[model samples]
Target: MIRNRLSELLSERGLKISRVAKDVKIARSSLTSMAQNDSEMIRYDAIDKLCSYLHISPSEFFEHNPINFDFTFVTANITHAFSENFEILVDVELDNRQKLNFDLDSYKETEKITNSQHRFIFTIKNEENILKKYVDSLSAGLKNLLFKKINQKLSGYVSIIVILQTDSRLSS
Candidate 1:
C-alpha cells in the first residue's frame, strides 16, 4: 500500500533531480531507486535527509492507499446451466454502465466441483477481439477492481466473453 511519492514531490515542488541529489547528498542510482518502488528497501539516514530537505512529514515520503474491494452494481444476473456438470452464467451491469459477461465452469472429472474445488482459471471468448476493444475500454481503476475481485473470489483463470449480439436495441 506504500507509494513512493518522490516523483510527485519533485514535480509538485518544481525541484530538480540534480538539486535533490546535491541537497540530500545521495547518489543518482540511490535516488532513482527510491523514486521508484523497484528498490529492495530504503535507508534511514537517507529518509532523514529527504524529510529534512523537503520539510515534509514521515507520511509524505511514502503514502498509504489501500485498494478497497467494493464493486457497485446497477444490476447483476446469475443463472446456472446444468448438464452432467453445471456452469454458472453471470452478467453484470456496473454502476458506471460498463457491462460484463462471464462464465464460471466448475466441471472437473465429471464430478460436481463443490467439494473438490481446486482449479480456478477462465478464458475470454472475445469474438470481437480481446485486446483492441474490450481490454482497452476498461479504465485503470475498473481494471484493478475487477482483477482484485477476481483474485479474491475466483481464487480462476476466468475467461471474459464478449460476443457481439443484436436484439431490439438499435445500433449502427
Candidate 2:
C-alpha cells in the first residue's frame, strides 16, 4: 500500500492543519482527511499544491510497505476445539530487516487417532526442514508472541503439531 507521509511530515515539522489548509487553498476537511490517510479520493491539484508548497517530493510524500505476511510472529496450535485441526504462521526478520513468513496447516488422520500418538499429515512437506531451521533461530520476542497466541487459542493444551514452510519464491 502506498501510504501518505503527510501526518508524519506535519508532526515532524510541527505544522498546523489550518495553516496548511489555508496556505495551500485546500479545503479544511480535505486536508485533514488527506493527512489522516483515509480519503477516498485525492485531487491531483492538492498533491501538486502540497508538493510545491511544502517541498514534498513524490517519494517523500508516500511510502511503500505492502502486506507480506498473515502474522507478525511465529504462531501454532494443536487444539482439538477447531475440528481437530491446528495451524502455524510466522513472520520474522532474519536477514537485514527482510521479513520472511512460514505458514503450516494440519491434516486429519482419523485412522491414526487410535494409535499411541495422533498422527497427522502436513501439506508443507518440501519446506518442513526449512521451518525447523527457522524455529531453531527464533528470537525471544518471537517465541513470546507465539506462546501467547497458542496459549489463548488452545486455552487448555496437550500436544501441538506445527509444520512451517517458507514462501515458494524464496530459495536456499
Candidate 3:
C-alpha cells in the first residue's frame, strides 16, 4: 500500500490547503482529497504543480517503502455498554519511547472518512536526549473505530482508546 504524506508535509510547513491551492492553481477540493488520500489517481500535472510551488521533490511527495518500527504491546480488550446504541470499545497500547508529539488536531478535523476500513498508523521511535518537549496526537474513526477527546497526561507513555460501531450506525 502507498502511504500519503501530504498532510504531514503541510503540517511541517504550517501551510493550509487554501493557501497551497491558491498558489498551486489547483482546486481546493483536489488538494483536500489528496490530503485525505481519497483520490484514486493523482495527475502528474497536479503533482508537478504542487512540487514546484512547495519546492518539494516528486520522490518526497510520493515516496514508497516498507515501514519497520519497534513497539511494545501494553494490552488489548473490548469493553463498552453500547448494546442499546450498537457500539463497542477496544483498547490497546503501543508505547512511544521517543516522547515525540506532533499536533494532529487539524489533520483529524479535515480528514474524510469515506471508507469502511481506514488505517491511521503513527510510529514514534526513541533515540534522542531531550526533555520538556511533547507532541499531541490522536487516531479516531478508523475501520468503524471512533476516538474522541483523548489526552496523554504523561510523556513517554501512550495509550489507545477505540470505539467500534456496527449495523451501519456510529455513536459518540
Candidate 4:
C-alpha cells in the first residue's frame, strides 16, 4: 500500500499529481496509475525515480504515513580555527518542497560553526583555487589566507527553512 500511502503523503503535502510528475519529469499517466493502487509491489526503479526527484530517501518514503504530529524549532552554534586547504560536504534533508538558499562567502579558516538541527555541514577549503564556488572548493592559498575565522559548524536538522535553488538535466 506504499502507493496509497504515497498518495496520502502527496495530499498531506498539498501536492498535485500533475505537478509532481512535471517536477519529477515522470509521465503523468504513470504517476496516475501509481496513485490508483492501494497495495502493490512497486518497482524500485520507479520508486528510485520518484524519490530521487522528490528529494526523499527510501527510509523517509517508507516511514511516511498519514499520522498526526507536531513540529518544533531548536538552534545551536559551533566554532573552529584552521589554516590550510580544506573541503567540506554538507548532507541536508529537505522537506516535501523546501530548499536551502546560501551564497558562498570568504572562508575564514578559523570561523566557528554551530548546529542544533539534523543537517550536517562539512566544509573543506581546497587550497588550489579562489572564488568560493557555491559548489566549488577554495584553493590552498585562499585556505591559508583564511588562517582562522569564526563560528561555522551547525548541529541539528533545521526544518526546511528556505528553498535555495534547483537545477536538473535530462540524460539519454
**Candidate with best lDDT:** 2
Write model 2 residue lDDT over 36-131, tens digit each, in one string.
655767889888999898787888886654332234222343324235344446564544667676655433233234423333333332434564
Q: What stretches of model 1 exceed 4 Å from their correct place?
A: 68-172
> Tens-digit lDDT track for model 4 on 1-172?
0223466678788888978888777788777877745224667677887777667777756632221112222222322211132223332223443433322221232222323222223343332232224212433322322221112212222212221111111111
Per-candidate clashes come to 9, 0, 1, 46
Residue-by-residue lDDT tens digits, candidate 3, 1-172: 2546788789999998878888888888888988865677888898888788879887778644222122222222222222111111212222543333221111111112544422223322321222212111221222111111221111112222323321121112
TM-score to true structure, per model:
0.41, 0.41, 0.40, 0.30
For model 4, the run of ten residues with the poorest summed lDDT: 163-172
Choose 2 or 4, whichever is better by lDDT: 2
Please give the range of 10 consecutive residues that has the lowest summed lDDT in model 3: 103-112
> RMSDs, each prediction?
15.6, 14.2, 14.2, 18.6
lDDT of 1 by residue, 48-139 (tens): 99998889988867654332223221322112221132233445444465665644333232222343232223333332333235435655
Q: After best superposition, candidate 2 residue 22: deviation in angstroms?
A: 0.6
Q: What is the TM-score (0 to 1) of candidate 1?
A: 0.41
